[PDB]
Design a protein around this nucleic acid. Structure first.
Ligand SMILES: [Mg+2]
Ligand SMILES: [Mg+2]
Ligand SMILES: [Mg+2]
Ligand SMILES: [Mg+2]
Ligand SMILES: [Mg+2]
Ligand SMILES: [Mg+2]
Ligand SMILES: [Mg+2]
Ligand SMILES: [Mg+2]
Ligand SMILES: [Mg+2]
Ligand SMILES: [Mg+2]
Ligand SMILES: [Mg+2]
Ligand SMILES: [Mg+2]
Ligand SMILES: [Mg+2]
Ligand SMILES: [Mg+2]
Ligand SMILES: [Mg+2]
Ligand SMILES: [Mg+2]
Ligand SMILES: [Mg+2]
Ligand SMILES: [Mg+2]
Ligand SMILES: [Mg+2]
Ligand SMILES: [Mg+2]
Lengths: 67, 143, 141, 58, 78, 145, 206, 55, 64
RNA sequence: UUAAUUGCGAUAACGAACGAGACCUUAACCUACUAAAUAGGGUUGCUGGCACUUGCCGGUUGACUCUUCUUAGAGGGACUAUCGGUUUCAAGCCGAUGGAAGUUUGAGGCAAUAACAGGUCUGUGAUGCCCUUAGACGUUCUGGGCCGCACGCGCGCUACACUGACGGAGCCAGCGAGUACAACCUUGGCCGAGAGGUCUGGGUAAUCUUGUGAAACUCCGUCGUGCUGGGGAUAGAGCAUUGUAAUUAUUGCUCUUCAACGAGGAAUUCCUAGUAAGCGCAAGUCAUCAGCUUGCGUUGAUUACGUCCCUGCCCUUUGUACACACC
């Protein structure tokens, strides 16, 4: 039952919309990017945010997506 | 080559050392044997009515050899299991103290156990030599 | 100095620390040779790495294991893991890569726990239940 | 440092308990050090909450 | 309590000579031997089942397969 | 290891201290079937009489029976301790005895009727047939049978 | 066979040819095959084991119970009552004694006897409660091969238990008797009797 | 109230030998580590004492 | 006679029954693999099992 | 679709808030860092024994050195990561692989709006009102009771035995706790058969009890289907401990009588993995007393991995003569 509630999805959406040139396909690089360019309080939320950011990046690479 | 008691299976070592101590006339048994439960937890005396004290002495001597040094009350904790407390849950009941004290003094007389400075009793050089000797006896007895 | 390493293997609350050295094929647990592991019916469990690998693989290797904590069979599984991991770590450190991977293939194809510590451990108890997940009886009337 | 306590002040209600606890950390330190500087160190840098104790052991 | 079992003594508490020839004659031809197998034939009480079973390890009348306590596993000598 | 056991001598029934006892049980557990004698006391008595522990009661000889009987009527003569005895300190005459088959039940009955006559709360509780040792009776002993 | 010299002297029979794993160093897992084709892949003879005792996580996913060694599943089903529930070393000893006993009687390598008894004693058609309260009906249905294995183990151990209860024979001996009788179709076996009687009920309630 | 008889009963031990230190009550006392506070007042003042709900 | 036949499931059609404990599958015979039935099973199944049937003309009916 | 008003979305709805999630504690994994005579290890001393080959098993608060395990700080680590299926191809689901870990990673702690005439004046020097306030419903002292017993019911404990009881022998934990203005945890040495007694010595605690050498368990024997060596209730006598005080047996110990009990009807309870269950230990009650509870660990499974059939819960639609709401 992993659904990635509001916060992670909205944060990843804003991350992509403001930092697409810097984001990559790899989870670890985007994790370091999330650490540096955004102040996520905890680290589990940081990891969820980076994971969904990578997923959205992969979807974008496949093609153009809504939202 | 060389052999220690750690190199021989336990139960065989206690059995053979008890047999050897029973064969020789040393290690006097207290006159109160045959009458004692050996523990409050137990409800009958040992099935082997005569000679069980020799087995207890053998086990005690092996235990002192293996460990650092052991007193009497610690042996009380070691022996003795669960008492059938009638219709109440079983607990742990320490074994009889007089029996283990007599074992320790008898082993002192045979010279196999020495009083340790840190309290309790440790093994002595002569008794430890006897212990490894009987361990070898058992080991080459096996094959 | 003598080529020597130290590894460990754990069970629920058991812990076996094994020192491996370049010896003469000498395997002792708690100062006693491996053939006298107490439960005597899980004895084959502790020979398992020996027979899976083959004794000739470590004939000039000596083994010293101190196992503490946990009950009997937990200790036995701890010694199993300690011996296996010690063999693998020694082969990695001083022997060769291929030998180590061959040992890992022989091991992990049989009782994966032999190199990987078990993750299952007891569940904390809770009030209103005499067990960790059980519950008291209900009256209802 | 743990205490279990029944929540209900009057025994009525489903059996519910709770566990309160602190943790005490000790972190002792010993020095093979000269006299006056050590005592000055002990008499300075004190934070409420943490309790400092000094044993000469000489 | 309810003695509906209606069991008899049904066990030779003491061995008798003819029963000794019986134990010896089918000491072989009992291709598997154990304490329960011995008492199954009504000829042993059960405590002397162990006695007779242990005595048969005298001239190799039967061979042991495993001598664990709480039971025994014996086969005919071949 | 085994013996034919001399067909024609192994007893099957015995009368020790005017109670019938089947002899085929092990000696100690056969002796246990007499009132006032339990497994511990019978075991010690058989030990003192030097008769084999693992022997059957129906095969031991006659003077063995008499020596056993003599041992278990004046125990203090045969180094049976002051303790381990059935009735010690004997509050009629202060001499630690050991009650036996008929003597045990009889003397228990005299002690019971003494407690009845003494008008002790324990005695009147015994006379009524209720619990004596001070346990709750709201929920226990709720039928006589 | 090439006894390896070491400072610790492992017994020769434990060193002989040990690329030949046996169950209790007595029975070969090779030569043992499943006669029935339906119950293959639900009886684990493929993987050799030196003991019928493994701390395997055989209850995490749905179907890993099949991958557990079949002798191990028999052991785990022996340790079934309140008085003896956690005791498994006792179950391992009982199974070892039963295997030796079965080796004695009709040698027929006892693992094959175990497998054949499990094959025979598992029902192939069963009933389910379908009646809508007012009318009580049992509707005949088919059983999964995994449930066939589970049920066969269940009745085998249950019959051994009820035979051993307040009886002279040891649990190992009664289990060996049940396994031997279920190796054939001998109706004297309790497990095979329950199998036949349940199947004929299911036939009576098509 | 003869001093020989008034409050003469010993109170070295038992239920009533010690009180609540909060309420003076003798029921539901916590003697662990010498807290000597009854359970309810302990639940009230645990956070001030240093005790917290943690798991 | 002993007309015991085998049938390998090719698909599982959900779980049926008032109890919720029985399932329904589509089995295809080991012989004549173009001949299939729908059959009720009582226990855990998945794509690959081989059921044993004492019938061949029976077809599964949803249990209510 | 999700465990989720969890999301993908469609849209007279747009933006938001609480709840859920997030969050903390705990359990993992750390041969990566910092370190350690209140934790361990190696080498070497000084020794003991056996082997005789240089080796094995030991002892020492003698030295040097190290942190793998034991600790605890800062950190790392998993985010369903990669891949394959399936999905208005979106949310997501399923499988395999790599992993320590892939059920929200397991277990919890807090936990919304509204409400109950739910419980507590008997926890409070929280308390309104009413009552009493001198031979008192205040306070204290003595003794009794809260434990009675023709009877019903609710948590449990011990059992009905062979997978066992009883003897010996093996010998394995993790949570704790522990004395000062008082007298706690007790080692060790002597006594006693035991409970216990006495003499000394540690420990205000990773130092001492303590490696809590616990039970179940394991090995070898006795028993042998007999209400029997199962079961240990009910009693008789005696020996001790705490206590100002033990009778209405406080509790422990020794000998004996050994009862009901043959796996328990209708009915009904708890529980899907280190789970149930078996087994005990610690702590809270404690001057003495648990068959209790809260925690902890040992051995450790069968069967699911689904459904709305019984009992209920959530959302939607519908009907209602119900709103103290189908009691
Ligand atoms: Mg013992
Ligand atoms: Mg019992
Ligand atoms: Mg439990
Ligand atoms: Mg480390
Ligand atoms: Mg995909
Ligand atoms: Mg959670
Ligand atoms: Mg009300
Ligand atoms: Mg008032
Ligand atoms: Mg009351
Ligand atoms: Mg309750
Ligand atoms: Mg035992
Ligand atoms: Mg410990
Ligand atoms: Mg113990
Ligand atoms: Mg009896
Ligand atoms: Mg008994
Ligand atoms: Mg039990
Ligand atoms: Mg209570
Ligand atoms: Mg479910
Ligand atoms: Mg109205
Ligand atoms: Mg109506």
């Amino acid at each position: 039952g992993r659904v990635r509630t509001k916060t992670v999805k909205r944060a990843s959406k804003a991350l992509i919309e403001k930092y697409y040139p810097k984001l990559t396909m790899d989870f670890q690089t985007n994790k370091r990017l999330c650490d540096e360019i955004a102040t996520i309080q905890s680290k589990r939320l940081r990891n969820k945010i980076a994971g969904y950011t990578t997923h959205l990046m992969k979807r974008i690479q496949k093609g153009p997506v809504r939202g | 080559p060389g052999v220690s008691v750690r190199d021989v299976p336990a139960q065989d070592f206690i059995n053979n050392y008890a047999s050897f101590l029973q064969r020789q006339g040393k290690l006097e048994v207290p006159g109160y044997v045959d009458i004692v439960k050996t523990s409050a937890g137990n409800e009958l005396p040992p099935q082997d009515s005569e000679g069980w004290f020799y087995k207890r002495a053998a086990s005690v001597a092996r235990h002192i050899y293996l460990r650092k040094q052991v007193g009497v009350g610690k042996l009380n904790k070691l022996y003795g299991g669960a008492k059938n407390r009638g219709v109440r849950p079983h607990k742990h009941v320490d074994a009889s103290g007089s029996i283990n004290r007599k074992v320790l003094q008898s082993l002192e007389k045979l010279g196999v156990v020495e009083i340790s400075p840190k309290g309790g009793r440790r093994i002595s050089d002569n008794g430890l030599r006897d212990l490894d000797r009987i361990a070898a006896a058992t080991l080459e007895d096996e094959e | 100095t003598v080529p020597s390493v130290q590894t460990f293997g754990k069970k629920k609350s058991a812990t076996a620390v094994a020192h491996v050295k370049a010896g003469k094929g000498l395997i002792k647990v708690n100062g006693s040779p491996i053939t006298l592991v107490q439960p005597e019916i899980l004895r084959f469990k502790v020979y398992e790495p020996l027979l899976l690998v083959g004794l000739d693989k470590f004939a000039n290797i000596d083994i010293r294991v101190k196992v503490t904590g946990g009950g009997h069979v937990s200790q036995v599984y701890a010694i199993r893991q300690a011996i296996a991991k010690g063999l693998v770590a020694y082969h990695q450190k001083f022997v060769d890569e291929q030998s180590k991977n061959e040992l890992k293939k022989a091991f992990t194809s049989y009782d994966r726990t032999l190199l990987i510590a078990d993750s299952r451990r007891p569940e904390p108890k809770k009030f209103g239940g005499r067990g960790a997940r059980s519950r008291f009886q209900k009256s209802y009337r | 440092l743990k205490i279990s306590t029944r929540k209900t002040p009057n025994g009525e209600g489903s059996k519910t308990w709770d566990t309160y606890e602190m943790r005490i950390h000790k972190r002792y330190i010993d020095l093979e050090a000269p006299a006056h500087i050590v005592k000055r160190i002990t008499q300075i840098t004190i934070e409420p909450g943490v309790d400092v104790e000094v044993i000469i052991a000489a | 309590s309810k003695k509906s079992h209606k069991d008899k003594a049904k066990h030779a508490v003491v061995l008798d000579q003819d029963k000794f020839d019986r134990i010896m004659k089918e000491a072989p031809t009992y291709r598997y031997v154990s304490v329960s197998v011995l008492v199954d034939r009504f000829k042993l009480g059960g405590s002397l089942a162990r006695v007779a079973l242990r005595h048969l390890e005298n001239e190799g009348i039967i061979k042991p397969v495993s001598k664990h306590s709480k039971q025994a596993i014996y086969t005919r000598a071949t | 290891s085994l013996v034919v056991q001399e067909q024609g001598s192994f007893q099957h029934i015995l009368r020790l201290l005017n109670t019938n006892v089947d002899g085929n049980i092990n000696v100690v557990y056969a002796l246990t079937t007499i009132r006032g004698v339990g497994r511990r006391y019978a075991n010690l008595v058989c030990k003192k009489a030097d008769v084999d522990l693992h022997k059957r009661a129906g095969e031991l000889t006659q003077e063995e029976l008499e020596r056993i009987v003599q041992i278990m009527q004046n125990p203090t003569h045969y180094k049976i301790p002051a303790w381990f005895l059935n009735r010690q300190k004997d509050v009629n005459d202060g001499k630690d005895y050991h009650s036996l088959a008929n003597n045990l039940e009889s003397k228990l009955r005299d002690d019971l009727e003494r407690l009845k006559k003494i008008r002790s709360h324990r005695g009147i509780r015994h006379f009524w047939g209720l619990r004596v040792r001070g346990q709750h009776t709201k929920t226990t002993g709720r039928r006589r049978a | 066979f090439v006894p390896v010299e070491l400072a610790t002297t492992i017994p020769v029979e434990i060193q002989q040819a040990q690329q030949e794993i046996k169950l209790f160093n007595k029975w070969s897992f090779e030569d043992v095959e499943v006669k029935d084709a339906s119950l293959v892949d639900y009886i684990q003879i493929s993987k050799p084991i030196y003991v019928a005792h493994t701390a395997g996580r055989y209850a995490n996913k749905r179907f890993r119970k099949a991958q557990c060694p079949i002798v191990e599943r028999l052991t785990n089903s022996l340790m079934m009552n309140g008085r003896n529930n956690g005791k498994k070393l006792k179950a391992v000893r009982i199974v070892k004694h039963t295997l030796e006993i079965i080796n004695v009687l009709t040698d027929q390598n006892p693992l094959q006897v175990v497998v054949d008894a499990i094959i025979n004693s598992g029902p192939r058609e069963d009933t389910t409660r379908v009646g809508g309260g007012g009318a009580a009906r049992r509707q005949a249905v088919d059983v999964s091969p995994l449930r066939r294995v589970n049920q066969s183990i269940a009745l085998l151990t249950i019959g051994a238990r009820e035979a051993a209860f307040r009886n002279i024979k040891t649990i190992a001996e009664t289990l060996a008797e049940e396994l031997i009788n279920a190796a054939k179709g001998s109706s004297t076996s309790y497990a095979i009797k329950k199998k036949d009687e349940l199947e004929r009920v299911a036939k009576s309630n098509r | 109230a003869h001093e020989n008889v008034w409050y003469s009963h010993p109170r070295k031990f038992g239920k009533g030998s010690r009180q609540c230190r909060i309420s003076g009550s003798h029921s539901g006392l916590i003697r662990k580590y010498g807290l000597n506070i009854d359970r309810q007042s302990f639940r009230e003042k645990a956070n001030d004492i240093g005790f917290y709900k943690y798991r | 006679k002993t007309p015991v036949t085998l049938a390998k499931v090719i698909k599982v059609l959900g779980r049926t029954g008032s109890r919720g404990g029985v399932t329904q599958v589509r089995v295809e015979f080991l012989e004549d693999t173009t001949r299939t039935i729908v059959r009720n099973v009582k226990g855990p199944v998945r794509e690959g099992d081989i059921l044993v049937l004492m019938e061949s003309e029976r077809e599964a009916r949803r249990l209510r």
